Structure formats: structure tokens, C-alpha cells
Amino acid sequence: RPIIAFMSDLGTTDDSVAQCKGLMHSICPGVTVVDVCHSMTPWDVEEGARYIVDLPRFFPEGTVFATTTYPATGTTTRSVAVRIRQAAQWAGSGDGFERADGSYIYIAPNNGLLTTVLEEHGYIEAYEVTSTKVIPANPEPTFYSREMVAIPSAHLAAGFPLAEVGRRLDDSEIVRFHRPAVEALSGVVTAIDHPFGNIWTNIHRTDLEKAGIGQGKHLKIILDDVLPFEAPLTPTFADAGAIGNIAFYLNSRGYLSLARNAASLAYPYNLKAGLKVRVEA
Amino acid sequence: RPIIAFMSDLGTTDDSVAQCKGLMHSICPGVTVVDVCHSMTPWDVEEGARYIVDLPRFFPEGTVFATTTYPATGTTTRSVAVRIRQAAQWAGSGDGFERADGSYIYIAPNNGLLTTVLEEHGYIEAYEVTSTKVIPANPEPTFYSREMVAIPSAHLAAGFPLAEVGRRLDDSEIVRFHRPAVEALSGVVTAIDHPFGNIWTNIHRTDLEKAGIGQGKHLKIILDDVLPFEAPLTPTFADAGAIGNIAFYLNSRGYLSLARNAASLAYPYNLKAGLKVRVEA
Amino acid sequence: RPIIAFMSDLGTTDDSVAQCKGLMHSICPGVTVVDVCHSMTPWDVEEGARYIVDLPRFFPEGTVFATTTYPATGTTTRSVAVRIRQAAQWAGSGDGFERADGSYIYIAPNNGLLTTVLEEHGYIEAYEVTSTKVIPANPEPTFYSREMVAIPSAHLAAGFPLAEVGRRLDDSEIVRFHRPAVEALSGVVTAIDHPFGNIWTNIHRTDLEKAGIGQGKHLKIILDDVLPFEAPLTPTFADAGAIGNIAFYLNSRGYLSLARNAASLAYPYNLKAGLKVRVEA
Amino acid sequence: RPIIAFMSDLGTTDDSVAQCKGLMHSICPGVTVVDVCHSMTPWDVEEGARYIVDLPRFFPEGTVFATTTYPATGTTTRSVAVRIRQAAQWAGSGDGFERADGSYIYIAPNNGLLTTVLEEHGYIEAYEVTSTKVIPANPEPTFYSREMVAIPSAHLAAGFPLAEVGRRLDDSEIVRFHRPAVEIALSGVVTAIDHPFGNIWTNIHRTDLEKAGIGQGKHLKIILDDVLPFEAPLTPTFADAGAIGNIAFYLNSRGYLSLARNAASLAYPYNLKAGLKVRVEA
Amino acid sequence: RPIIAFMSDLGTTDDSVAQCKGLMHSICPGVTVVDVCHSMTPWDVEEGARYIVDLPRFFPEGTVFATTTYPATGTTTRSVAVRIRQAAQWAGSGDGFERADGSYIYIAPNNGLLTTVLEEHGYIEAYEVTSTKVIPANPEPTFYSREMVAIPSAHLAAGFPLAEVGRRLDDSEIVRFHRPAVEIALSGVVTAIDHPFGNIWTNIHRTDLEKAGIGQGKHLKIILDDVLPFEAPLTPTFADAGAIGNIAFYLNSRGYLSLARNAASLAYPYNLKAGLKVRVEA
Amino acid sequence: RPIIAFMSDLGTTDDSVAQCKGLMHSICPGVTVVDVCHSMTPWDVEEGARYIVDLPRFFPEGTVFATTTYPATGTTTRSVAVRIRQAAQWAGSGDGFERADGSYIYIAPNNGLLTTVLEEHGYIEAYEVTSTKVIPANPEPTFYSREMVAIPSAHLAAGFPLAEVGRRLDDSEIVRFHRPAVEIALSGVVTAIDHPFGNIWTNIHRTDLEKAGIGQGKHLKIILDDVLPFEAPLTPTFADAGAIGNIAFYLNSRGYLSLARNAASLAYPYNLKAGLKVRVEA
Ligand SMILES: Nc1ccnc2c1ncn2[C@@H]1O[C@H](CO)[C@@H](O)[C@H]1O
Ligand SMILES: Nc1ccnc2c1ncn2[C@@H]1O[C@H](CO)[C@@H](O)[C@H]1O
Ligand SMILES: Nc1ccnc2c1ncn2[C@@H]1O[C@H](CO)[C@@H](O)[C@H]1O
Ligand SMILES: Nc1ccnc2c1ncn2[C@@H]1O[C@H](CO)[C@@H](O)[C@H]1O
Ligand SMILES: Nc1ccnc2c1ncn2[C@@H]1O[C@H](CO)[C@@H](O)[C@H]1O
Ligand SMILES: Nc1ccnc2c1ncn2[C@@H]1O[C@H](CO)[C@@H](O)[C@H]1O
Numbered sequence A, B, C: 001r002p003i004i005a006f007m008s009d010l011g012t013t014d015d016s017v018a019q020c021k022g023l024m025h026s027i028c029p030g031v032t033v034v035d036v037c038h039s040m041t042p043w044d045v046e047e048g049a050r051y052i053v054d055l056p057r058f059f060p061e062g063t064v065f066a067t068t069t070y071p072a073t074g075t076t077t078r079s080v081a082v083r084i085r086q087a088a089q090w091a092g093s094g095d096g097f098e099r100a101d102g103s104y105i106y107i108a109p110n111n112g113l114l115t116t117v118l119e120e121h122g123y124i125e126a127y128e129v130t131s132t133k134v135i136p137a138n139p140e141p142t143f144y145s146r147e148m149v150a151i152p153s154a155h156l157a158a159g160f161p162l163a164e165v166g167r168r169l170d171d172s173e174i175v176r177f178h179r180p181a182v183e184a185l186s187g188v189v190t191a192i193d194h195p196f197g198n199i200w201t202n203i204h205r206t207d208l209e210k211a212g213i214g215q216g217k218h219l220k221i222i223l224d225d226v227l228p229f230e231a232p233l234t235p236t237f238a239d240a241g242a243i244g245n246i247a248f249y250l251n252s253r254g255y256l257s258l259a260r261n262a263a264s265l266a267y268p269y270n271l272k273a274g275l276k277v278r279v280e281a
Numbered sequence D, E, F: 001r002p003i004i005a006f007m008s009d010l011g012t013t014d015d016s017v018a019q020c021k022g023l024m025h026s027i028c029p030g031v032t033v034v035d036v037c038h039s040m041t042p043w044d045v046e047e048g049a050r051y052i053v054d055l056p057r058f059f060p061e062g063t064v065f066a067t068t069t070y071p072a073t074g075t076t077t078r079s080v081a082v083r084i085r086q087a088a089q090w091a092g093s094g095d096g097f098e099r100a101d102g103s104y105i106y107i108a109p110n111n112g113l114l115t116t117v118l119e120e121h122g123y124i125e126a127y128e129v130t131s132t133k134v135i136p137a138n139p140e141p142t143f144y145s146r147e148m149v150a151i152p153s154a155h156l157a158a159g160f161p162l163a164e165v166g167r168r169l170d171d172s173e174i175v176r177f178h179r180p181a182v183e184i185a186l187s188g189v190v191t192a193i194d195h196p197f198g199n200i201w202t203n204i205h206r207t208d209l210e211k212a213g214i215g216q217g218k219h220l221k222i223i224l225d226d227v228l229p230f231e232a233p234l235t236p237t238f239a240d241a242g243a244i245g246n247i248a249f250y251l252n253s254r255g256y257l258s259l260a261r262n263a264a265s266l267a268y269p270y271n272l273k274a275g276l277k278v279r280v281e282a
């Protein structure tokens, strides 16, 4: 019972996503399509990477990940299809559901979208998608998200051999983007968690415990060099005490974050991604 | 062929809902997940209750209702799992599809979310959700909507015995919220029906016929003590005559409501929930 | 394995769509419901027609199309159910998936919604939907999108004979709307493609090649008689050269369109549908 | 002690008005320039009319009114200068300042701006402003508000003869506009939102009311835009609505039926703007 | 050389203020009307108070202050006219203009508008304005700002006797309001956003500071609305924050602790408005 | 009959400007203060420059221009006072008011505000304002617009000697800014949106045009922000665009190429703001 998890920049105000799904079913009958998100900022590769990087451990083995923002649609560019190694705490009841390696496939424009996927998970082999068996002989130039991602993803869900979609790629041929690094820790606001107004940073758990920082530690987190927040590190929001109170926590992705307890922190003060972050103890 | 109807405050701008669905499928293969809404105002329990209270009669028997806003995520709080009694006019073709009792299960934070569910439908037994068989041994503090609702809901859809998720609860142990009552009838605007701009009140059919009010009766409905609307009670919008004309009707949930015929009433004049309502004849 | 593609004006902020889906499953167990869009402007028939007109070739044969905006809900009006002729370049891998005729069914309010469907595709026979076997004996006046579209659509997906839903209609009895025609070509902006900000016009490929216009031709496209854009006709966005540069192209629906390469054209300058269009060479 | 009362659409965000004022002082030294308003909606002649039609009784005899919105600036269109007749119950302390006839001059573009001035005050002699003694020989094309209104207004204030500004006009040569009508239950329109209070003015006059048997203390239903309803008695002032926030129907200082909330804004919360239909039923 | 300083809530988008000015000139010829502000939030008495409480030392002796927001217009409510005592370190060049006592008159609605004028300047004689020699016999009900403030202000400016405007009041007859308190770590509130700069004024006075041992050059943490934090030393001016955009804590020209960014706006980016709680901790 | 023309960034929503005016009257009795503008964008020196560079020819000889935006208030930064040379075809009726040389004084912060005044009018003697005879001995740190501009402007208007305000400056001591350049097809920038009409001013001058062989009645293509295109002939005024709403390219009263719609706003509908690139091609 095959699954395609589908992430795109196609939006939710027209038939575009539905066209893709129609084909997915046409090709892989009995397929279940799980919508990740279709609301991402178009062409914002680094935003899209964030929505797909942590998915594998939550999905059954065999799940195909169709992930696409395709600003170079209609060009010589071709999509890349990749079987990752490690799905990567396990998710689920009990001690979790351990996922076998080489058990997930990403297919995506070769435009950097998979950058964090490949490094957090690794990959066995990557292939350029060119065979007319998994893509159209005459692709609609403007709709590669359908022609060069959705359509072949469904072939791959129906058991089509990855190694036959086209030629094999070298690591150097796989486009990557580059994240700002983390340097007293300096970082950046990665995202606002809608609809809660929570604030996410690029500082990982692993960066804290490397500076002698664990739960309960009193910290200062400064935004934009003008907003000096102060609070103890806590596992969750309610630990901040009263409603509205600032909380400092590690989010479900393993990253230092701020919020208010049952109140929005970002929205009322128009705090957005990009603001810079300084962490002190 | 199990169904999970899923309602949350997780939104539609990231991978959160997808993570949950991935697990649901992992646990209950062949499960179909029906999205109710994920756009509710976070932490607004009474808004979430409104989206889930009328669902059972529309769904096949055996449907599990996973409904969650979890501001106390990461705390001692635990979710409650409940088998309701009456699913409650029947919905469907002909005279409708009669639903057997004890045929639906709700699982939700024990924070008042199910208040109207339990009173409109009743319940056979309620249980605290604690067994590591339906929830993780080490839950992510900030994501109880996944760990303590989504994950066990899928076990319950796969046939896991309700009585084994944890200890049985007493009625007093089930958190409830309290609605403003209805008192010439006085009430309150409960919701604006997007995207139509229709206005919903807490005055039920049953409150009208208890004051000698049936179809065709000329009424006055005043909002905020400054907007005196006048119209006959009618079954639907077009009965108001011309487009734009005010209509007074009972909505599909059985509640007195106002609108314009093929025009928005609320949006142009920024009429929101909370406004108070006076009904006269 | 039956499919219902579902398009409505019911929105995504309440349980309405879910109620419908619940019934669909109740009636046609094992049915897969593919959401097209539920965000259309309510009562805007011509907008809804645009989201459903190009679907058939993307879906498996047998797919039932449940498409509904129902401002005359609760009136004498009844829905129309139609088996189209031609599904209509084929979509998919290779040379595409050829679709047999008479292989798709639309069901919809008889209010003009299907106007472009029937003319672009044709139809074998149309029927008024009245039988209490596919609709309720006592319909909720305000919710015909559920009672007179969703419910019977699921019967039709479960194999119920189209000719038995009610009486057969004459062409004249099928409500239609009328599009502005295309006249140096004059036309109109049909839609803004969210979230990209691309601009769509009513000028078809077929209108260009009828004026000696093919790829590479230098054109001028004027909006609102005040915005004289100039660019060569190109297959896709990146052909415009640098990012931000204007591109003139045929979209995936076969219509002259404008945009910027990896930049929004409409949003920053508040360009909306309705603006008039003049095309020169 | 010459006075020019200055109304324009030039705004409050550049030196336009100040250029004009500098010339007024240049031409007429010792002049006092009283700002009427400079924030009117651009080119909205009927809106400007309301800001200048009630002025004369509040001002000293001989005051010159310089009133301009000049969308046809740079064309053959010229300004007109007019001695009005009646200053029209007086304003001021006691029983008020009695104003003699023919004591005020309006100078404006001949584009209808004065339609209502002439209608309520009548006039005596109107002249086209063409003389290079009171306007520039080579006027800046975009700045006729200055060239054809401000400058000449100052010569007039200095005592320059009205009859010498140019040729005398006939009534048919004075461009006029048509007020929105009141139909008769009364139907009219919202003429203006009174900022910053959010009060709502209609074109419905006291005389239309008393002509439909509607007097003080009486209950009306007013509907805006064919759907938004309000009910209240006709009262003299806002506080008569009782509680803060309550709805009030009154006659404004200009004689027109108006709607408001008491020490709160009615227009803004419902996004009400000029132009909406008004239906009044008793 | 009579002068009336005019503060109202009448706005900048109609002829209201100009009607008032025309009468001032009518009643007191040669008067100069100095606009203070006309854009205050409607009916917000405590906001108006701040725009008129610091004025006297900047103005010539004998200047009359006409200050009005009149939400009770058309009622029994009357205006009060007051000769203040102390003009209160002087403003102007050198060591400043020394202002004699009892040299300024305020006329306003008796609705508390003058609460802070009387508190900081004290007063000598206050009178109720009822005489038909300085107000109209039949006042327009909606326009008391004109009928009961503007008109009488002009007679006063012309030298009309203060004691003759009506009966003399006692302190208990002068309506007053209560300032938002400062609790004591200090807690107060934002009183105003200083446009167009986006600076933020608090009700916390220099004296509250020096009373908590807080002086120049010292580090404070200020929290707005119980969550939005800022840290900086107390400095005399904006540039002392260093780089453009940096946060500054200072005492404004009125003596109140304030927050700002240096040549950049603090309020607008975070949508900060008057009314927010302020917590200052050292 | 002394006159001070007053331009500041102080705004229209408090008593700041009125404090300043009170002192002007205090120091120079009988002075007339002409408001230029007080609504300029805060700290935007080049925007202020445009509101004060065209003024002298419209004003009487001897008028003092008090022009200030003072982001460095409270520092060592001082103001400068300057007698300009050329008042620069005259404004006014007939062939206009001929203005003698050296007849205007500007006083402003030495922060570049006068860059364009000095460039177009030249100057004769510029002085640093330091004397405690024309400024305060203990200036309020946040209010230099008042302490270092308003107060001294008044002494100057009263006839106080310019050379005595402080030491004489050299050209190199007068801070200046750089105008946005015009590159050459011409590329420039939008300098301002002309409110409330929504007209669009560019930095492209008449001389840049006639230097590229571009004259009246000729077709141009103008592109804003590298993507938004407009086409029209160069005409003298808005109506020359024909129909209401139509696009017009013209030279404004200041000599700069500008874009507009005829009796309709161009900027607002497309959200166009100052700063956008402008490309003009013929
Ligand atoms: N104006 C545009 C410029 C570049 N790429 C676009 C544009 N509009 C849509 N796209 C891309 O086309 C893809 C469809 O194949 C979308 O995923 C999207 O990234
Ligand atoms: N800032 C926050 C404070 C309290 N609860 C939150 C916050 N953000 C998300 N949540 C809750 O966490 C749940 C995830 O388990 C969501 O359903 C939501 O209700
Ligand atoms: N205020 C309204 C007036 C007319 N039709 C409405 C209104 N609100 C909802 N509807 C219609 O009712 C249908 C539900 O059956 C929706 O598809 C919608 O088109
Ligand atoms: N874009 C424009 C179109 C038509 N008239 C305008 C425009 N901008 C300014 N004006 C007019 O120019 C006059 C100044 O002479 C103003 O009164 C105003 O009405
Ligand atoms: N809607 C209103 C309610 C109460 N007072 C008002 C209203 N509109 C204007 N006013 C008051 O009328 C006064 C003019 O006399 C103004 O100062 C103002 O305070
Ligand atoms: N937040 C601020 C930063 C820098 N300068 C300011 C600020 N607020 C006001 N000013 C300046 O103070 C001057 C008044 O002396 C004004 O001209 C203005 O430029």
C-alpha cells in the first residue's frame, strides 16, 4: 500500500495539486498521497528543505517523497531521485518504530532543495530523471513540478527501479545551498511557527550541550540586537509559569526556540525570520 | 477500512500534520485520514469543540476522532479517550443512515475540548491515555498533539481496546468548559461562517419553538445593541428575495443565523464573534 | 477503487468539507476523495468552472467530479449530473494516458458551473438529480452542496446508474454563463496564479497562431491601457534571462500569460483579474 | 487688516501652500492668511464646496475667500471672482455678528467649486480672471491654484478692483454641478465622513425632514448601503444618545441629518465611507 | 499684540477650525492665532492635557490658551476660564524668558482637560463662562468648542474682564481626572507615542527616577506590555545610543522617562501604542 | 513686517511647533510665522532640501528661513546661518517679483539640509550659531530644532546681526550631501511621491532631458523599479493626457521629469514609493 508524501509551492487556490494527484493515482493505483505542505514561499529552496528534512522516520518504509519548487521549470535542468541511507530517537509508541536504511526515496528538482536531506540522512545513489518511462516525452515547460516530480514519484511508488530513471549522478553534480553556521552562541531566526507565533533558531541541542547547557539553565536570548529575553531553559511552554510568560525551549526538531505560554510572541510585534540571535548564560 | 477524522490547531504551513499522518498510517496500515480542519485559533478550546461536535452521524461506524489543541503539552496532563453513546435527523440519502450507539471514539487532551461532544452525545466510558503501547515511552514535550492524540488514535483505529490505554476516569475528572446560556431571546454571536460572512448565534431551533417561533415569523435580530435587523424567518438565503437582502435562518447545525443572499454580511462591516444578540418578534 | 475529485466554495475553516467526505465514504466505502480546491470565491461560478474544466485527462477513468457553489441552495433548483464525451496532448509519462470517452461524470448545481466543461468536453446525457436514492428525502435547505452534490456523487462513484438519478434534461434546460470573447488581439485578465503572481489571459494558443504568432515572436502586452509590457514569446519563465525580468508565455492550460522570472509580477503592484489586455506584434 | 481665507487640495506634505502664502504676503503686506483646509480629497469639487459654503458669517466683512482644486490646471480654464450677496441667524456672542450684503469675495477655478456658495448666498457680479495685473503673464502650467487663485486673491485683498480682473460673466458662464438628490420615507446619500470623530453626514437637509413631518425627539430607522440598519430618535446633540457608544441621529451645524456614536466613532468600525446610499424611514 | 494659542480635537479635514478663527479675528482684530495642535485623539482629555501643560513659558505674558475637546457639547456642561499662577528654569536664549505670575489665561470645557495645568502652575481665580457677552445666547448644540471656547477666548484676548464671564468657581467645582499612577523597580504605563519619530513616552517622571536612585549613564531594563524587553543606559539624547537604530532611554523635554531608537522609529515596527504597561527594573 | 518661514520634521500631533512659535513671537513681536511644512519624513535631509530650495522668490526680501531636522540633537553639532546670494524668471503677477541678491537668510542644522539651497542660490557669508545671545546657555538636549533653529531664527528676524551669531565658516565646514546621480537612455530614481495626488517626481532634470534631445510633445517609455512600464509623450500639464486616468509625463514646477495620471492617482494603486529606479528611454 504505497505512499507519496507531497510537498510543493503550488498553493491551495487552484487545481494544480489535484492534477498531480490525479496522475499519481493513475500511475500507482491504490496509492495514498499525504500532503505535507503546499503553502511554502515559492522558489525559497531553504524553506522547502525545512519541511521535508525530518519526515522519513514518521512514514512507513517505502514512502516516496515528492518535493518540489521548480523556478527553473522548462529548462535543461532535470530532477534528481535519491535513495537515502539513514531515516534517523525513533518516532511512535513505545521506544518507537525503527526504520531500515535505504528505505526512502526523494525526488526533486536538482536545485538545492534536498541539501539538508542528503547531509542529515546521507544517500546511497542519485540519478538524473530523464527516461520517458517516468516522465513525459513532451513536458509542459512551465509545469515540471508535475512532469518531472509528481509523475515519476508515482512510478517509483509503483516499484519502478530507481537506477533506470536516468544516468547516475556524482556528488558534485548535486546542487547544494549553504546554511549560515553557528558560532556565547550566535545564530539566526530560521522560522516563525504558525499559527502559534513561536520563534525558531538555527542553534541545535548539540550546540548547547557543547557549551555546558542543559535543562533549567538560565539563559539570555537577544533578537536583532535589541530584544534581550531572559528565561530558564525548559522542556515545554507551560513551564514558564503564567500565560503570556516567555519560554525558552528545544522544539520537536531539536532547536533552541522562544515563545509565550498560550500566547503569540512573534505576531503582535511583527517578529520575522532573519532576525539575528545571541545566546548567553 | 478504518477512518481517522483529524482536527487540530497545527495549521497548514509546515510538516506537523504530515508527521502525525505518517505515524497514523505506520500504525494502522490502510487507514484513511479525513482532515476536518487545522486552521482553528490555537488554544481556543470552545472553537475546536464546535468543529467536532456534529461529526459522528456523517462518518462510518468505527471512525476515531482525533481532536487536539494542546497548550498544556509537555505537562502531567494526559489525553482522554472516550466512546460516546448516541451519534444523533439522520444524515445521508433517503431517510438517512442510522448509526449504532457506542460506535465512535474521541481522543483528545483532557482540557475541555470534548465538553459539548460528551453532553450532546453522552459517553459510555472515559480513560486516561498512559500505556506505552499507544503512546511513546519518551514523548516530545512540545508535541503532545502527535504523541498523545495522533499516535494512540491510530492504535484505536487498528482495533486496540479502549479500556487498556490507561485508567478509567470519573466524570468529575473530565475537564469541562461552560457556555454562555440563552435567556424575547438573548444570546451571542458564536462564529462567522467563512468565506460567506454569515453570522451564527447560540440560539437553537429548540429555543425558538419554545417561544412560539416557527418559519415565516417576522423577527428582529439586534447585534451589539446597535444593529437592528428585520426579516422573516426562512429556510434558506434566496428566500430573502433579491441579492444582498438580509436573511434570517436556521443553519445546518440548528442555530439561528443571519446572512445576505449571495453577499457577505460580516466582512464589509467587520462583524465578528462575541457580539451580543437580541431576538424579538 | 473509485475516486471523487471534490471542488467547492465551502472553505477550509470548519467541518463542512469533512461532513461531506464522511458521507462519501459512508456511501462508497474504499472511495478516495481528491481535494481540488475549496478556497474559490463563493458564488463566483466562472471562477469555479476554471478549476474543474481541465481535470478529466489527469484522473483515472471512472472518476466522479463533485463540483459545487450553491447560492440557490434550499430552492426548487436541482443539481445536474452529466457524463461527458471527450476527456481531451494526453497527460502522463511517455506520450501520455489516453482516456476513453464517456468515462467521467460531473455532478453540480445547474447554475452555469459546468458551462466550460460541457463545451470543451461535450456530453452524452444530462439528468436532474431528484431520486431519494441519491439525495435525502428531507434536505437541509442551506447545505445543498452536501445534500445535492456530495451525497449523490458518492452513489455515482459506487456504480449507481446515472440515468436513474432523475429525469433527463434538454440542452436548453442546462444553465450556462457567457464568457467575454476575444477579438491585434484584445482580451481580459482571467486570473492571478497564486502564489507566484503570474497573470493569465483569455487569449488561447489557438488565437495566436491564427494571427501568425509562434514562439520567439516579439510581442507587446498592455494591461488596463496603461502598462505596455514588451517581451518575446517563450516556452517558460527562465527564458526571460535574469531574475525579475518579464516573461511572455503560454501557461499549462494553453493561454497567453505574463510573469516575472522567479519574482511576483501581480502582487507588488496590486494587479488583479478583470484588467483588460491588448496584444501586439 | 486684510484677510484671505485659503482652502485648497495642495496638502500638508510639501511647500506648495507656503509658496502661495509667500506671494500673498508679497502682494498684500500685513495680510493675514487663515487656513481653512488643505486636506480635501483631490479634485473632489463637491467636497470642497462644503468646506467653503458656510464661511462668510464667521469672517469679517471684506474677507477674500481663495478656494481651489484645479485638475484642469494648464488649460484654457480660468478662475472666476465673485462678490456674493447674502452672508447667510448670526454667529458669535450674544445674538451674533450681523454681516452686510456684498461683503465677501470668492475667487476660484470656474469648475463648479462655487456651485453651492452661489446658491445659498446668491451673487452680484462675477468676473473672469484674465488680467496680467492680477495673474502671471506666463503661468506655470501645473500650478494654477497659485497662478490663478492665490496671486489674484492677494491683489483683491489689497483693494485691487474686482471689475478689472477681466470680463464680466453671465450666470450661464459659471460652471455648476448637480447636488445628489433626495428622493421621497426619504432616500439620500452619505456626503462625508466627519473626521476624526467618525460622524456621518448625509445630503438630507432639515427642510426635507420637516417636509416629511419629522421633528425633534422622534424615532427614525436609517439604513446605509441598503443593509446596515440603525434606529434612534432625532436629538440635538451626541450625549442625547445616553451611554457612550450609543447611536445618535442629529442635525449638524450645517443643517443636515447626521449619524454618530456618542464619544465614539461610528464610521471606522464598519468601514463606512462617503457615497453610500441612505434610506430614512419613519 | 493679543495672542490666542488654540488646541482642539476638531481636526485638519474641514472648516471647523477656520470658523473658529474667523470669529476670533472678528471679535479681537489684530489677534494672532497660534495653532498648538488640532489632531489630538478625539475626547481623550488626558492626551490634550499634555499638549497644553508646558506652553506658558514659551508664550508672551497675557497670551490666552483656548483648549478644547467637548464630547458633552450641547449639554449643561459649561467652560471654565482660569488665570494660572506660575508659568513653570526658563525657555529662550541666554538664561531664558522670565514669566511673571498670573500672566496666562486658560479657557476650556470643565471636563478635566486642565487637571494638569492647574496642578503644575496652580491658579488664582477660576470662573464659569455663562455671560452672553462672551458666549452666544443660542449656542449651536454640537459646536461648543466654538461657542464656549473659541468665541469667549477672543473677548478675553481683547481685554474683556475675566471676572465678568460668569460666577467664580471653587476648587471642588473644577472637574479633574486622575493621572495613571507609578507603582514602586517601577511600574507605569506608556502615555503617548511621539509622532512621527516613534518615540515612546511614559508616565514615569524624573522625580520617580531620582527617588529610586536612578541617575544619568545608568543601566535599566524596560519591559513593555509584560513581555517586550529593552536594555540601555539612561542618557540625555538619542545619539548617545551610538549606532543608528540602537535603543535609547532618556528624559524627554517634559521630564518623563522615554524610549526610542536613534534616527529610527521604535514604536511602529513593534506596533507599540499608548496604554501598554511599563516595567522599569535596575 | 518680519517673516519667518518654518520647515521642520516635528509633526502635527503635539505642541512642539507651537513652543517654537511662542518663542518666535516672544523674541520678535509682530513677526509672522509662515508654515512651510512640518510633515517631512523624519531625519530625511534630502527630502527636506526639496521643501526649502524653491522658496526665496515667493517670499519678501529679508524673510528668514528656519529649516530643521535634527537627528544629532544634543551633540556638538551646531546650526549654521547663511545669507544666500541669488533668489533663483520671477514668480507673481505680470512678469513677477524681482528679488535682490543677498536678501534671504537660512538657518539650519549643519547636517547637509542646505546642500541644494547653497548649490542653486550660492551664498555669501555662512556662520556657526554659538552665541548665547541667540541660543540658550543650557539647551534642552532633545530639542535643538527649537534651541538652535527656532530661537536664533527669531533674533535674526528681529534684526540681530548675522555675523555675530558666531564664527564664520568656510565652504569645507558646511556639511553637504550627494544628490542621487543621473546616468546616461537615462537612468535616475524617484525622489518623491507628491501627496495627495499620487504624482511621481524623479531626480531627472529638464537639462538632462534637453541634453538627450528630448523635448515637448515627444514619446518616452519610462520604467520604474526595472519592470513597471509606462508610455506617453512629454507634455506641459496633466490634462494633456486626454482622458481622466490616462498617464502623463511632464516637468513639474521645479524642473524635474514627473509621472502622473490625469485627475487620478498613479502612485497609490501600484504602491509606488520614493527610491525606485527610473529608466527613461526614447
Ligand atoms: N513566475 C514564475 C517564475 C519562475 N518559476 C515559476 C513561476 N511560476 C511558477 N513557477 C514554478 O513552476 C513550477 C511548476 O512546474 C512551480 O513549482 C514553481 O516553482
Ligand atoms: N507557544 C505555545 C504555548 C503553548 N502551547 C503551544 C505553543 N505552541 C504550540 N502549542 C501547542 O502544542 C501542541 C503540539 O503538541 C499544539 O497542538 C498547540 O496547542
Ligand atoms: N449567505 C449565503 C447566501 C447564499 N448562498 C450561500 C450563503 N452561504 C452559503 N451559501 C451556499 O450554500 C452552499 C451550501 O449548500 C455553499 O456551497 C454556498 O454556495
Ligand atoms: N495628477 C494630477 C492631475 C490633475 N490635476 C492635478 C494633478 N496633480 C495636481 N493637480 C492639480 O494641480 C492644482 C495646482 O495648480 C491642484 O489644485 C490640483 O487639483
Ligand atoms: N460623535 C461625537 C460624540 C461626542 N462628541 C463629539 C462627537 N463629534 C464631535 N464631538 C465633539 O464636539 C466638539 C465640538 O463642539 C468637539 O470638540 C468634539 O469633542
Ligand atoms: N528618536 C529620535 C532619534 C534621533 N533624533 C530624533 C528622534 N526623535 C526626534 N529627533 C530629532 O529631534 C529634533 C528636535 O530637536 C527633531 O528635528 C528630530 O529630528
Ligand SMILES: [Cl-]
Residues within 6 Å of the ligand: A069, A070, A071, A072, A073, A077, A109, A110, A111
Ligand atoms: Cl529549479
Ligand SMILES: [Cl-]
Residues within 6 Å of the ligand: B069, B070, B071, B072, B073, B077, B109, B110, B111
Ligand atoms: Cl492542554
Ligand SMILES: [Cl-]
Residues within 6 Å of the ligand: C069, C070, C071, C072, C073, C077, C109, C110, C111
Ligand atoms: Cl445555485
Ligand SMILES: [Cl-]
Residues within 6 Å of the ligand: D033, D034, D035, E021, E033
Ligand atoms: Cl489665523
Ligand SMILES: [Cl-]
Residues within 6 Å of the ligand: D069, D070, D071, D072, D073, D077, D109, D111
Ligand atoms: Cl479645474
Ligand SMILES: [Cl-]
Residues within 6 Å of the ligand: E033, E034, E035, F021, F033
Ligand atoms: Cl504663528
Ligand SMILES: [Cl-]
Residues within 6 Å of the ligand: E069, E070, E071, E072, E073, E077, E109, E111
Ligand atoms: Cl465635555
Ligand SMILES: [Cl-]
Residues within 6 Å of the ligand: D021, D033, F033, F034, F035
Ligand atoms: Cl501665513
Ligand SMILES: [Cl-]
Residues within 6 Å of the ligand: F069, F070, F071, F072, F073, F077, F109, F111
Ligand atoms: Cl543633525
